[PDB]
């Protein structure tokens, strides 16, 4: 009777977990210390679930309802919701005595948030990442995330998004880089370099930018050149963050 | 012996005041309850007082700094600031008994919000809103503005960036109403629709918000067909910010 958590599985690690937007809320519970079970779901499957579950789609777009993970269910009230950010704020509210994660004077900042964090990183990010994480993705994953994803950048084969060595590639990169520069200024922006968005306290931002840098981590790999290279850019900012979260980067078994 | 606020003067109304971006240091001025003078500058004048006064630029590009207003320069501590989020942070930190705009937990996503407003907003406004400028400037500034202008837009002549009844004009006017509708979305992220970014104070993102949108206003002027219907959008919310505002939509006599 604990919270059901529904995840993608991947091959990226041992214990499966890779999804930037299903870290996001795996950190989020961690960090609360609320209880949960995965309940494991390949990309095709995800819109069944949902239906099955009484998830809402998180977006709604020319040609129907667009399901997605993560998704909670919480049987201590009955309620299924969908997307990390409205999961976050499910959290704060249902379980008023855990640790906040959007104080309610910075929901509409966090809402702001949320949207140049997507400009600034996640749209750089995608050329190099998503054609990463096809490549271990089980095999029906695979077929659903390729198919779409070539599918809306045009018929764009995947190996031809951004090649090893590539000029594409390294561009790809320089945006990226410049991305993170850009919420190295906002974290420093009154003269205190900081690591946490509210200063001492953990935000629901800071576990965003988590989340997706996990996600880069774990699917690039911890020993690939790519990643240590990452490890370095603005003085080991987002590697330091990454240590900070530590504690909370866990994939229970149980 | 007073703060000095240097500003664009135009002729779209009688006070001369236009600016987006001098007005939310005008707003942050007037709110806060500080004296200062104003003192007009023309654009092709904007570089040459920024190095007499010792203004910073605001930003650093291959082709040169690049100085712009709103900055003001406090004979009090004989600091001269330039850019209105920082005049902002340093009127908080330097005149700590004015009611704040930047709570200091906020600083980090306030920086956050200036990049996703950018992204949302200003882009945008441009089509429409810069050649609407263009032709209420003094001919000093109308020279250097199209110039510039009509150069960074590869040649187009302001006259064709949206002109009226035209389809570039009616898109440019779709793309301006769902980037409002995205801070209408971060405004009631939470479901309860706030006027306010922090709910019940005002803050710099407020400010933000109004210096943009009074320019829309005193630009395309308060009784155009455009305006009139920009006061519906989102169930009149931007309106009603200004109403909340016009106590410090006031440029001094002084
Ligand atoms: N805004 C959502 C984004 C969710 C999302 O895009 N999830 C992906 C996994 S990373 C998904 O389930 N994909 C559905 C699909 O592509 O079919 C959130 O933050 O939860
Ligand atoms: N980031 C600056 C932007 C200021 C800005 O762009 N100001 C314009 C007037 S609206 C300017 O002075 N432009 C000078 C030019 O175009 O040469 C701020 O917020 O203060």
Redesign the pocket.
Known sequence: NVIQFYD?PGNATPDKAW????W??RYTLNFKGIPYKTIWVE??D??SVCKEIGAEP??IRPDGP?????VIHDPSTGKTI??????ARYLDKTYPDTPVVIPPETDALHAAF?FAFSEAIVRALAPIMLPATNAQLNPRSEE??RR??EESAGGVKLEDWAPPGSEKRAKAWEKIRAGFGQIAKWLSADGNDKLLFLGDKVSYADITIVGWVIWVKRVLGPDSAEWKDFETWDDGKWAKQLALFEKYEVVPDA
Do not use: C, G, W
Not at 19 to 22: A, E, K, Q, V
Not at 66 to 70: N, R, V
């Open positions: 993608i999804s930037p937007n299903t996001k809320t990309y095709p995800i819109a998180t977006s667009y399901y997605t993970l993560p969908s997307d990390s950010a409205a999961i949320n659903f995330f779409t994803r």
